[PDB]
Design a binder for this molecule. Structure first.
Ligand code: SIA
Ligand code: SLB
Length: 424
């Protein structure tokens, strides 16, 4: 139902033909100053940085009449945004500003909050915010998310994140508020809080609507702006074949991947503020869309890991498993085996996207070559092994495949796997 949603669209800031333009039909003027990077590939975002006098600035100047006839009753503002590195102690930055003469609206970030503000005058404002979960984001909330703010002078001001309502407040009397026709994208530090690291901000598809969109329409909009079958890396960018990742289990983000006697094991991270420990995997395609190197749901694939200059495949072992109390029926360890000339069945997996409001992840199923026989799901658990010279069995946290009726595990977060791109 996009046709009806789009009827009220009054600004549609998009990258078309390597140029930022308003495609809504109201012909807002758009200019760039400083360092503004345009992405030539989907999602065609623009990137701004915070440091230097030559930092990027994107200025949108709307038709003043469309503003006047739209903003004073009800409106919605939507856009995709990414911040790196959005650490929990971030100082204050205004990032998207529509304030002139001490009135208008503005969006800023501080600590773990993204804040939307109606500014009535120099002495009066009303704000709402999204705050990310710090305990689950020590490396920073550096992922793409979809913001939608809605306002109704006769009702509430709301902010949604990835299509989910996060904050709502009754709008107070804002008599005399004056909406500016100008919107300025630029990362501007607030000086009285009262030299930090540069941050980057990426933006794409910044829309404004002259109606208050409801939750249902916000989600339709959310989904219309993504390829939901393209699996995403941990920051929400397209997952790629032939590229190094840190593979993580959503239930164990504080663990990195290691290996011991060809058994993969999970060790506690020493650097909680980064993803920079342990071994990396590379995803290899068996079956998928050969037009690019993007990973899609339903693709058949396998995983490589290189240790001490030897390249292995992850594979489902065929040995009995032992656990302190749990039964281990149909549970098999995932370990590492030397590559061979031909793809062996026990290295073959099938991937599916598994996203939610706070994580981009996947589920990974044990598969045969043509995907006609899906026999299990990848999980994680603590089992008894003798590794690395051990005489006695010890407990290790290891990746596993659960076969038999794996359906019972489908809703478990233990089956959710993320892929963090390696910076170096
Ligand atoms: C020894 C060997 O032939 N290795 C080849 C492997 C194996 O065929 C598969 O990993 C199955 O083990 O496939 C590659 O595409 C890879 O994964 O990098 C190229 C590599 O040269
Ligand atoms: C493939 C594999 O498991 N390699 C592991 C090896 C083997 O355990 C060892 O060569 C045979 O026992 O030992 C390490 O180098 C080590 O403990 O320092 C870690 C490495 O990840």
């Amino acid at each position: 139902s996009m046709a009806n949603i789009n009827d009220s669209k009054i600004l549609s800031l998009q990258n078309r033909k390597n140029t930022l333009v308003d495609t809504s039909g109201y012909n807002a003027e758009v200019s760039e100053e400083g360092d503004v990077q345009l992405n030539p590939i989907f999602p065609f975002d623009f990137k701004l940085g915070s440091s230097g006098e030559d930092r990027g600035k994107v200025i949108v100047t709307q038709n003043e009449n469309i503003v006047y006839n739209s903003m004073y009753e009800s409106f919605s503002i939507s856009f995709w945004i990414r911040i790196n590195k959005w650490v929990s102690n971030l100082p204050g930055y205004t990032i998207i500003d529509s304030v002139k003469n001490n009135s208008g609206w503005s969006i800023g970030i501080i600590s773990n909050f993204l804040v939307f503000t109606l500014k009535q005058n120099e002495d009066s404002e009303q704000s709402i915010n999204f705050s990310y979960d710090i305990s689950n984001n020590a490396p920073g909330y550096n992922k793409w998310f979809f913001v939608t703010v809605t306002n109704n002078m006769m009702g509430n001001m709301k902010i949604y994140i990835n299509g989910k309502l996060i904050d709502t407040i009754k709008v107070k009397e804002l008599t005399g508020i004056n909406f500016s026709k100008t919107i300025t994208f630029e990362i501007n530090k607030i000086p009285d809080t009262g030299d930090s690291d540069n941050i980057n901000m990426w933006i794409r598809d910044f829309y404004i609507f002259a109606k208050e969109l409801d939750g249902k329409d916000i989600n339709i909009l959310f989904n219309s702006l993504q390829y939901t079958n393209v699996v995403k890396d941990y920051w929400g960018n397209d997952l790629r074949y032939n590229k190094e990742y840190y593979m993580v289990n959503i239930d164990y983000l504080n663990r990195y991947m290691y290996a011991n006697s060809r058994q993969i094991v999970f060790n506690t991270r020493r650097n909680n503020n980064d993803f920079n420990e342990g071994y990396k995997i590379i995803i290899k395609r068996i079956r998928g869309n050969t037009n690019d190197t993007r990973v899609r749901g339903g693709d058949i694939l396998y995983f490589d890991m290189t240790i001490n200059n030897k390249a292995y495949n992850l594979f489902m072992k065929n040995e009995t498993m032992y656990a302190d109390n749990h039964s281990t029926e149909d549970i098999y360890a995932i370990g590492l085996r030397e590559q061979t000339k031909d793809i062996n069945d026990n290295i073959i997996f099938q991937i599916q996207p598994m996203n939610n409001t706070y994580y981009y992840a996947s589920q990974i199923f044990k598969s045969n070559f043509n995907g006609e026989n899906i026999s299990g799901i990848c999980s994680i658990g603590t089992y008894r092994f003798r590794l690395g010279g051990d005489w006695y069995r010890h407990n290790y946290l290891v990746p596993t495949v659960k076969q038999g009726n794996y359906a019972s595990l489908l809703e478990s977060t233990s089956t959710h796997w993320g892929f963090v791109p390696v910076s170096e």
